[PDB]
Amino acid sequence: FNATRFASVYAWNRTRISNCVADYSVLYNFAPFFAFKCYGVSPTKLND
Amino acid sequence: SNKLDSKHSGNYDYWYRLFRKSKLKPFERDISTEIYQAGNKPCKGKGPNCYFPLQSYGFRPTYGVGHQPYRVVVLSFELLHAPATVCGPKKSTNLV
Ligand SMILES: *[C@@H]1O[C@H](CO)[C@@H](O)[C@H](O)[C@H]1NC(C)=O
Ligand SMILES: *[C@@H]1O[C@H](CO)[C@@H](O)[C@H](O)[C@H]1NC(C)=O
């Protein structure tokens, strides 16, 4: 989330996230979202 | 039903909901236009982190089968050993 040189769409820089506990409040507090739509999981249900 | 919910240039009349605070109870309606809250911002409007609860179910005559305007009606009964207001064609004989 706190990158400075996000790669362009023609590269779509993807990162592998493993061996950590995914807390979504750190994701929330960094970005004042404009599109937080979800398809497979509920936005409210991510910490469980 | 692709002949009643489709026309040239499209038809975005229908609606459906993707954003609600909690699950829907069985046989309980929830018609309302309340913008879903993302986080703790009380935003009342469209755009950033405050989304409209319902989006268009837009239909056009040329979609895929999984995207065709399917018409669905459900029928619900409460069958048991009880009186009835709905019956079937059957004549009544005489008592002996
Ligand atoms: C990124 O981190 C810096 C330092 O921790 C902070 O000042 C800044 O607000 C953060 N920005 C985002 C978008 O996370
Ligand atoms: C009242 O209860 C019925 C049955 O659960 C439900 O369908 C309906 O939506 C409720 N009223 C309102 C205004 O939501």
Please provide the DSSP assignment of B42-56 as one string: ---SSSSSEE-SEEE
Report the C-alpha gap between B33 and B64 in whole angstroms.
30
Residue A29 phi, psi (nearest 5): -70, -15
- Beta-carbon contacts below 8 Å between A and B: 16
Residue with tokens 């002996």: B96
B39 at interface of A, judged by CB pairs closer than 8 A:
yes
B63 to chain A, minimum CA–CA distance in Å? 21
Helix, strand or coil, per DSSP, at residue A13: coil
Task: Tell me how far CA of residue A33 lies from CA of B33, B38, B71, in angstroms.
Answer: 21, 8, 36
Full DSSP string of B15-40: EEE---SSPPPTT-------PEE-TT
Residue with tokens 């829907």: B24
Could you identify the atom of ligand 2 that is nearest to the CA of residue B29? 9
Q: Do residues B33 and A19 lie in contact, with contact meaning Cβ atoms separated by under 8 Å?
A: no
* Resolution stated for this PDB structure, in Å: 3.4
Q: Is A33 in the pocket of ligand 1 (CB under 6 A)?
A: no
Q: Do residues B34 and B51 lie in contact, with contact meaning Cβ atoms separated by under 8 Å?
A: no
Residue type, A21: V
* Positive or negative torsion for Cα B58, A32, A10, A46: negative
Report the C-alpha gap between B62 and A29 in whole angstroms.
43
Question: Nearest 10 degrees: CA dihedral of A12, A21, A33, A29?
Answer: -130
Report the C-alpha gap between B80 and B96 in whole angstroms.
26
Which residues, in sequence order, are CB contacts of A20 under 8 Å at separation 6+?
A: none
Strand partners, B17: B54
Experimentally determined by: cryo-EM
Mutational pocket test of ligand 2: of B22, B27, B29, the residue with most ligand atoms within 8 Å of the beta carbon: B29
Q: Which residues of B1-25 are buried (b: 16+ CB within 10 A; e: fewer)?
A: eeeebbeeeebeeeeeeebeeeeee
Task: Tell me how far CA of residue B16 lies from CA of B6, B54, B58, in angstroms.
Answer: 17, 5, 10
